[PDB]
Design a protein around this nucleic acid. Sequence first.
DNA 1: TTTTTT
Length: 437
Amino acid sequence: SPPAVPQTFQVAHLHAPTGSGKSTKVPAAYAAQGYKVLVLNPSVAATLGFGAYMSKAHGIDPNIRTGVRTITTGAPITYSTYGKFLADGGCSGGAYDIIICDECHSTDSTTILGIGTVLDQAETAGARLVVLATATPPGSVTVPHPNIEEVALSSTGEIPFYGKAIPIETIKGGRHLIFCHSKKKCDELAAKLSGLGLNAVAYYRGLDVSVIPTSGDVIVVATDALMTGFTGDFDSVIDCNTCVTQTVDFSLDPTFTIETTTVPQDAVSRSQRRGRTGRGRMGIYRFVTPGERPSGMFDSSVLCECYDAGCAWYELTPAETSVRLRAYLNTPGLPVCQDHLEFWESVFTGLTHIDAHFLSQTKQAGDNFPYLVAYQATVCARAQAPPPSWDQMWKCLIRLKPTLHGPTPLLYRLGAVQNEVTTTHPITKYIMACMSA
DNA sequence: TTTTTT
Ligand SMILES: Nc1ncnc2c1ncn2[C@@H]1O[C@H](COP(=O)(O)OP(=O)(O)O)[C@@H](O)[C@H]1O
Ligand code: ALF
Ligand SMILES: [Mg+2]
């Protein structure tokens, strides 16, 4: 039996290995007790996947809510992504008795902001139980899984893979999942395997979950868009053991810089990726490297991304997002980070009167910090000055050069700077004061 | 050079 439901609001932690049944069995047990359950996951493929399965294996077609697709059935169970949950208004888009926060170990801004939202509104919203579920709580390390056998890759094999090689034999038939660190890498591999006579398909953000055949032989080459909560019935998993990290650097040149670099995977990633196999049956995990870095903490850039997301996506004021983030930090058992809430709130509080047209173009482009990018562009346009550079990031200005001249009013560094720079603009000064003190 | 939101 799952974490019992208390009379009044309470927060509980649920730790169980990957494939245990936290996302299906648990909520199914709550529903059977007559409770309305809301399950939040960071992944789109995962959210969508629960639908067909819960129906066939637990006799209940649940509601599915994702940015791209939604399925309303009126059932007592609802599965949604943190993103769609926020976009729907948080704890105001429905009244549930139980809210399960899956993959609560995640350190992506969307999940952070999501969980912070529920921990701040759940009680008042009438929720009596909030469950923080995960197979890899902060501080934990990868341990042996009862359904998974691990076999290291070697220099033997006809398919080059991050230094090592992949024997065709291990993937000739059956169903297998290969994790790559980049999107182009997936397309490269998928193509190569297809040219070898194998049925391979690439998968990542944006692609339809249907590209993954529900049955039959197949080799899915994907990114971390298929790292958690997903069950593709894979006979094995091949891990490149490489991740893409993003950190903020207070370089005072003139302000801060957000750099995205490829680094070796941590413990969270290793267990979750490995966990995509051996789900309800035996499985095999092949890797390139045995080591794994620690987990349980996240960079300050993530906080920055939350405020940016709150402004550009969720119509949240910097102060409002601070109320939600505070709730997250005040909750034990969750990933920790430097308490810079006030610093970031003050920075975004100063970025006023952004150009709507520019924002709607940065969001469409799917940038990491749409708001910051759009604001930098707003300051340039309103200064008759050119952007930091001319790469895709600043395409919203490309059709304006005839009027853009002089130095760029650099507010911060989102990418490479190739034009002349000025650090005397009021906004730049403002941000500097938020840093120095 | 990853994912999630109109
Ligand atoms: N979409 C699915 N298709 C087939 N089997 C599934 C599916 N989803 C879940 N299962 C089965 O139920 C088990 C529990 O899945 P799940 O609740 O998602 O695990 P957890 O949340 O603990 O990672 C899995 O081991 C798997 O065998
Ligand atoms: F939630 Al899991 F494997 F732990 F999908
Ligand atoms: Mg799960």
